[PDB]
Each structure stands twice: as C-alpha cells, then as structure tokens.
Paper text:
The T6SS of Pseudomonas aeruginosa is a complex machine that the bacterium uses to intoxicate neighboring cells. Among the toxins this system delivers is type VI secretion exported 2 (Tse2). In addition to acting on competing organisms, this toxin can act on P. aeruginosa; thus, the organism synthesizes a protein, type VI secretion immunity 2 (Tsi2), which neutralizes the toxin. Our structure of Tsi2 shows that the protein adopts a dimeric configuration; however, we find that its dimerization is not required for Tse2 interaction.
To gain additional mechanistic insights into Tsi2 function, we solved its X-ray crystal structure to a resolution of 1.00 Å. A molecular model fit to a 1.68 Å resolution electron density map was used to calculate phases for a 1.00 Å data set collected from an isomorphous crystal of native Tsi2–H6. Two monomers interacting through extensive contacts were modeled into the crystallographic asymmetric unit. In the observed Tsi2 dimer, the long axes of the two monomers are arranged approximately perpendicular to each other and the molecules pack via their coiled-coils. This interaction involves a large (725 Å2, 13% total surface area) and predominately hydrophobic (68%) surface area, indicative of a physiologically relevant interface. In agreement with this, the molecular weight of purified Tsi2 measured by gel filtration chromatography was found to closely approximate that of the dimer (calculated, 19.16 kDa; measured, 19.46 kDa), and we observed strong interaction between Tsi2 monomers using the B2H assay. Superimposition of the Tsi2 monomers showed that overall the two subunits adopt highly similar structures (Cα r.m.s.d, 1.1 Å). Interestingly, modeling of the electrostatic surface potential of Tsi2 showed that residues in the vicinity of Glu38, including Asp23, Asp45 and Asp49, generate a prominent negatively charged surface feature. From these data, we conclude that Glu38 and Asp45 of Tsi2 are major determinants of Tse2 interaction. Taken together with our screening data, we conclude that the regions of Tsi2 important for Tsi2 homotypic versus Tse2 heterotypic interactions are topologically distinct; Tse2 binding occurs at the face of Tsi2 opposite the site of homodimerization.
Author numbering:
A (entry chain A): 2 to 79
B (entry chain B): 2 to 85
Write the structure that this text describes.
Amino acid sequence: NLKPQTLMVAIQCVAARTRELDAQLQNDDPQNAAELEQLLVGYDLAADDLKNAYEQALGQYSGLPPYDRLIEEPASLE
Amino acid sequence: NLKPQTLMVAIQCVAARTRELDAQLQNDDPQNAAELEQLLVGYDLAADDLKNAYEQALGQYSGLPPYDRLIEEPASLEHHHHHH
C-alpha cells in the first residue's frame, strides 16, 4: 500500500504539471495544444483516483493535510 | 487502489517535477538549494514507492511498459542536426 506521503507528493506533482501545461496552451501551436488537452483530461482522471485514495488515507492516518490544500496553486505564482 | 493509468501519470509527473528541480539546482545561483534538496528527497521517496506499486499492478503477462521507460529522461532520446 502506498504511503500517505507518496500520495501527497503525487497529488502535488500532478496538480503542478497540470497547471504548467495549461499555462502554456494559449501560446502553443493549436495542433500541439489540442493533443495536450487530451493528455490533460487523463491527468484529471489520475488526479481523481489519487483523491479517492487520499480520502481513504485521511480515514486511516493522522497528521495529513486536507486534500484541497495539496492541490492549491501556490501563492507566489498567483 | 490506484489504477495502472493513474500510477503511470503519477510516475511521469513526479519524474517531470524532479527534472525541473534538478535543472534549478544545476543553474547558476540556486536559491534555497538545501530546501530544494529536501523536496527532492521526498520526491525520490515517493518515486520509489510508486515504482513498487506499479510493479505490483502488473499482470503476469502485462502489456504495460517497463518502469524504466516511464522515468527515462526525454532529452536523452533527442538528436539534433543542422543541414549541411
């Protein structure tokens, strides 16, 4: 079983890549952006599966932050 | 449970973010390098755990790719040549 710290890092990294790829779509060649757009739906499906696993972890383990905190866009970027 | 597809995305996103942090550490004047290194320890630990989970996810005759293919450095596969 994956450790809760692992779930946290995965959640954070999938959220960060999703943001980074989204940010550049506007400038990207439309052909490329369209293909990324489809990859990014796949990222969101993965993100949902990770959330479900994390919610199970929140019922098992203490000392974990709320899900919405993990995926929050960092203040220094917004 | 995590689906195989979810594990692949997680593995590849952790690897991508790891590469981004490594590039920052290699550039001039990394700020808070010790702290970037702390983040990388956690990244590495998650990566190892995800690796183990991915191996667990594979059937005996899986179609899914080797783990090493998921984490390989993209630039390492590129070749670049101008026209003569």
